[PDB]
Amino acid sequence: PDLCAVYAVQVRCKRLDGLGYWSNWSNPAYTVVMDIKVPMRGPEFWRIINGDTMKKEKNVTLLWKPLMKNDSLCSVQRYVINHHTSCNGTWSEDVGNHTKFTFLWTEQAHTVTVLAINSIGASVANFNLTFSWPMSKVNIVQSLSAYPLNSSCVIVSWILSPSDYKLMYFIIEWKNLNEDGEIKWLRISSSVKKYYIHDHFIPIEKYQFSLYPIFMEGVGKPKIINSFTQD
Amino acid sequence: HTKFTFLWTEQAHTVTVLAINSIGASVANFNLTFSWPMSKVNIVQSLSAYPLNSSCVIVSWILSPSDYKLMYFIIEWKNLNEDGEIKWLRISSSVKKYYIHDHFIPIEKYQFSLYPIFMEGVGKPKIINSFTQD
Amino acid sequence: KYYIHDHFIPIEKYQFSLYPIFMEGVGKPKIINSFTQD
Numbered sequence: 001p002d003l004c005a006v007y008a009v010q011v012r013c014k015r016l017d018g019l020g021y022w023s024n025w026s027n028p029a030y031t032v033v034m035d036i037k038v039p040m041r042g043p044e045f046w047r048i049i050n051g052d053t054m055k056k057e058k059n060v061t062l063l064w065k066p067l068m069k070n071d072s073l074c075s076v077q078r079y080v081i082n083h084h085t086s087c088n089g090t091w092s093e094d095v096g097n098h099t100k101f102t103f104l105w106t107e108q109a110h111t112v113t114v115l116a117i118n119s120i121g122a123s124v125a126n127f128n129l130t131f132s133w134p135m136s137k138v139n140i141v142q143s144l145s146a147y148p149l150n151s152s153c154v155i156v157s158w159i160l161s162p163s164d165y166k167l168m169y170f171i172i173e174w175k176n177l178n179e180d181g182e183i184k185w186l187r188i189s190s191s192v193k194k195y196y197i198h199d200h201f202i203p204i205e206k207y208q209f210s211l212y213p214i215f216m217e218g219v220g221k222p223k224i225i226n227s228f229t230q231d
Numbered sequence: 232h233t234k235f236t237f238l239w240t241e242q243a244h245t246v247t248v249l250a251i252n253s254i255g256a257s258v259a260n261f262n263l264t265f266s267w268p269m270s271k272v273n274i275v276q277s278l279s280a281y282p283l284n285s286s287c288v289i290v291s292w293i294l295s296p297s298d299y300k301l302m303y304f305i306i307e308w309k310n311l312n313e314d315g316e317i318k319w320l321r322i323s324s325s326v327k328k329y330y331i332h333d334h335f336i337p338i339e340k341y342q343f344s345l346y347p348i349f350m351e352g353v354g355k356p357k358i359i360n361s362f363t364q365d
Numbered sequence: 366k367y368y369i370h371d372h373f374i375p376i377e378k379y380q381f382s383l384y385p386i387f388m389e390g391v392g393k394p395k396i397i398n399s400f401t402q403d
Contacts, residue, residue, distance in 0.1 A: 147376045155376065178337035179284035202285070204338040 003036045004074035033074050035118035041071040042126035043079070045114050046171065046185040049105075060131065061102040063183070067116060076116050082126075084111040108133055109218065132218030138165060140213050141223035148203035148228060149196070156209050157194040158223065165215045172197065173210040177226060203228065242267055243352065266352030272299060274347050275357035282337035282362060283330070290343050291328040292357065299349045306331065307344040311360060337362065375400065 010025035043064040051058030067076055079095045085107050092115075095101050103112075111130040116123040140163040148154045156172055170188045172195060175181050188195050201207065206227055213220035237246075245264040250257040274297040282288045290306055304322045306329060309315050322329050335341065340361055347354035373379065378399055385392035 149374050149376060153374075176284070176337075178282050180287075181284065202336065205285075205336070206338075 006030050035074045035120050038121040039072050039116040039123040042116050042123040043067050043114055044187055058105050059102055060105045063100050075118055078117055080115045080117055082113040105131055130218035135218035137221055139221040141211050144211055144223040144225055145229040146209045148201055154197050154201050155194055158211055168214050171212045174207050177206045177208050239265055264352035269352035271355055273355040275345050278345055278357040278359055279363040280343045280359055282335055288331050288335050289328055292345055302348050305346045308341050311340045311342050
């Protein structure tokens with residue numbers, strides 16, 4: 001079931017006709033971790049946008065986590081980012097084993113895809129994220145409320161307005177606004193209307209919860225709240 | 232013992248704590264002058280406190296000009312919501328913003344007192360009882 | 366007043382029924398379907 005774990009293997013033998021004894025078990029053999037297939041899935045990534053609202057150019061810092069054993073399978077030697085744009089077409093940038101990359105977003109639509117590469121090749125199923133200036137205005141989240149359930153779980157719930165755009169999935173993003181916390185994020189199916197976030201949440205602190213609707217055409221306008229709803 | 236209580240009666244009382252070992256007393260010792268005139272001197276024009284995270288708060292201040300030679304600052308902070316031990320730290324007078332590393336719960340009401348410390352003694356603190364929302 | 370020790374997620378809607386129990390049998394419960402915000 002797991003191609004990238006060390007298995008111990010021992011073999012013993014006996015006469016096929018049954019007239020005899022079993023041999024002792026052989027000295028254990030162990031696998032060496034080598035890449036055995038390309039990675040099954042590319043890493044989940046999100047973006048930080050550093051840019052004054054008055055500038056046409058914005059710095060987009062992509063952030064991902066290293067793949068877990070199930071998704072990397074055995075190893076990731078380096079990460080390569082495939083960029084796709086209407087004007088410059090497709091190009092690729094090798095990021096090595098770094099988990100963060102910052103590029104300049106200039107075009108009206110820029111689709112980015114992060115690939116994981118091992119000694120055999122690139123990951124089969126990869127996540128993409130389209131950065132679109134028109135789409136950043138689309139708002140489908142009618143209401144958004146956040147209630148801390150406990151110090152280990154917050155429900156974030158939302159109601160959706162009808163939309164002509166095919167919603168693919170949600171990403172909930174949360175950060176403390178009281179802390180310089182790392183921006184934590186998670187991808188969630190578009191079928192979901194309430195989610196249990198498991199993280200350490202101190203319920204009085206002010207957390208920003210941003211629900212980004214993600215469409216084929218790109219990231220919609222987030223709904224943002226800066227306090228828990230007392231109602 | 233790490234704590235001592237004395238009666239302050241005079242207009243000016245300078246105190247110095249010495250550490251002594253089997254050879255003798257400490258070479259370089261801190262002093263603190265308690266002066267009733269100086270307790271009225273206020274040089275801290277504004278004081279604001281903003282929690283940066285649960286492990287660091289910047290306390291920042293602007294200074295008015297002063298004829299007294301400021302030696303250093305001490306920032307003192309305590310929860311006003313908790314019976315917390317009064318925590319304090321000495322900071323150079325050259326500093327105008329400092330990163331306090333302690334466990335800070337950002338909504339709780341902390342009192343931050345910036346005491347200006349002069350040769351003539353402790354000046355009047357500037358005190359705030361809430362984080363500045365501005 | 367009683368302290369119930371169980372895993373309670375405070376926003377979820379819990380029904381709490383207090384049944385008064387008499388020699389003659391179970392009385393009418395008082396029922397609430399939400400926490401009291403007052």
